[PDB]
Design a protein around this nucleic acid. Structure first.
Ligand SMILES: [Mg+2]
Length: 492
DNA sequence: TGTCCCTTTGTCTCTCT
DNA sequence: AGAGAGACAAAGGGACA
């Protein structure tokens, strides 16, 4: 008999009881835990199904699932019950910060290291606890913290980094490796290749930090001479997420793409400078002629789709869905491209296919309005939030469909929609803001934190924003969102 | 096996002007 | 607003006990 038979059965046993109180998990939560945390993690969640759910700790099931669904999730769950009170009272962290720290593989290691090192890091190394929390909140968090403690002085003094840079480098998976590689390679990359420490920090400030710095060091010569590329264009490929894989794939496919399809180097750099760049490039070489065949898409439209993170998923979903979206849903190829040319194009595309008839028939939007909402990063999220929240923003808060679509139609629209639904009453009813002023504030990228900052002022007034009327705060909030507000906060 | 750590890719959100 | 930067997570491999 296949070994896994027993454990698998154990899994289904324990996981049927978890559909019971007090977590009520929905199959797609039990799977998640099962896949990443394993059976020990499903069986830890059961064994601690009460201790975690209410007084003392009081975690949402969402928050229990987040802690459990990683390797060592059992250890994390045990450690969180032990240290969360210790960390909120002895160190002053929110429990949401403790959950953040715990929700990665080896979470236990992270938690115990924050417990052990946060004093020495804040006192003797000058870090804020929020910096310590960010460093901690990735896989290998424990490693990154011990490495920060050890290398912060040598990185700042011998190498000229600001502690902020050291923290930005540290705050990724493999933070330890990136830090160590930045130490070793910073002088080599600066003194031999004329890179600013700033550019070295940007290369290092990703996952595959170590990998990207070493691949830049090895390949900058081969790329800038025998491949007509600038130091700037190599830095950009290496620091935008593509890292090692993207740089090596730029070597391979730069001539193939150009020579066979007439793409400039700038178009190749842009396709490269993203997460999964290598994937986008390879998919572009593979799929371009299929798309552009028989007066299909123009090349430039392929370059566009491809030049966002997830470009490969976007290219393949267009290939698959262009026909049905145009035939069955009355969309132009131009529209399909626009939806696709954003991070998560694939998600937006699939969500338009699913939700366009619903949003038109049941909610009275136009296809154009649907395309507009879908045509931003996180399109899937904005579109699903529009469906959830349209009848509520309209009926309960008096907003027009037009106004909702407008809040919806930026990056973060989901966040902006959910914040408007929650903050409109206190803003209007308690502080005299008009619905239109509220809709205006939220109708930008960063609508959410801009609404929250406006509320932070009219709820617990900083004396530094006092000479500003509501109408002035509103104008500032529209113009530069939270950062503009915090900008004036620094004036008193 | 369970746990810890690292890398790559995909996706979502916010900033900076 | 478009480019750039930063956050959040899924999934796989190495390493080791
Ligand atoms: Mg594994």
């Amino acid at each position: 008999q296949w070994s896994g038979a027993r454990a698998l059965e154990a899994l289904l046993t324990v996981a049927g009881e978890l559909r019971g109180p007090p977590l009520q998990l929905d199959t797609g939560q039990l799977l998640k835990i099962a896949k990443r945390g394993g059976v020990t993690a499903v069986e830890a969640v059961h064994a601690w199904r009460n201790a975690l759910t209410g007084a003392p700790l009081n975690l949402t099931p969402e928050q229990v699932v987040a802690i459990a669904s990683h390797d060592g999730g059992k250890q994390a769950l045990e450690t969180v019950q032990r240290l969360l009170p210790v960390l909120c009272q002895a160190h002053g962290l929110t429990p949401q910060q403790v959950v953040a720290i715990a929700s990665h593989d080896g979470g236990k290691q992270a938690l115990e290291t924050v417990q052990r090192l946060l004093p020495v890091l804040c006192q003797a190394h000058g870090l804020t606890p929020e910096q310590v929390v960010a460093i901690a909140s990735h896989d290998g968090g424990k490693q990154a913290l011990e490495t920060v403690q050890a290398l912060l002085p040598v990185l700042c003094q011998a190498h000229g980094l600001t502690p902020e840079q050291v923290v930005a480098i540290a705050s990724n998976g493999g933070g330890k490796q990136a830090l160590e590689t930045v130490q070793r390679l910073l002088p080599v990359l600066c003194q031999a290749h004329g890179l600013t420490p700033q550019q070295v920090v940007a290369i290092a400030s990703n996952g595959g930090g170590k990998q990207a710095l070493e691949t830049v060091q090895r390949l900058l010569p081969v790329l800038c001479q025998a491949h007509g590329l600038t130091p700037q264009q190599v830095v950009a490929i290496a620091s935008n997420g593509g890292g090692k894989q993207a740089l090596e794939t730029v070597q391979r496919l730069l001539p193939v793409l150009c020579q066979a399809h007439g793409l400039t180097p700038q178009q190749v750099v842009a396709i490269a400078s993203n997460h999964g760049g290598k994937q986008a490039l390879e998919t572009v070489q593979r799929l371009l002629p299929v798309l552009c065949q028989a007066h299909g898409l123009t090349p430039q439209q392929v370059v566009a789709i491809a030049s966002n993170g997830g470009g490969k998923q976007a290219l393949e979903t267009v290939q698959r869905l262009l026909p049905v979206l145009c035939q069955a849903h009355g969309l132009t190829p131009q529209q399909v491209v626009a939806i696709a040319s954003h991070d998560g194009g694939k998600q937006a595309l699939e969500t338009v296919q699913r939700l366009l008839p619903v949003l038109c028939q049941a909610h009275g939007l136009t296809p154009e309005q649907v395309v507009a909402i879908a045509s931003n990063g996180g399109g899937k999220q904005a579109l699903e939030t529009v469906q959830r929240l349209l009848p509520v923003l309209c009926q309960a808060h008096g907003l027009t469909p037009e106004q909702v679509v407008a809040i919806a139609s930026h990056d973060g629209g989901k966040q902006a929609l959910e914040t408007v639904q929650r903050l409109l009453p206190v803003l209007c009813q308690a502080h005299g803001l008009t619905p239109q002023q509220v809709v205006a504030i939220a109708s930008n990228g960063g609508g959410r934190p801009a609404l929250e900052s406006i509320v932070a002022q009219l709820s617990r007034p900083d004396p530094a924003l006092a000479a500003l009327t509501n109408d002035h705060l509103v104008a500032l909030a529209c113009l530069g969102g939270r950062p503009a507000l915090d900008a004036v906060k620094k004036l008193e």
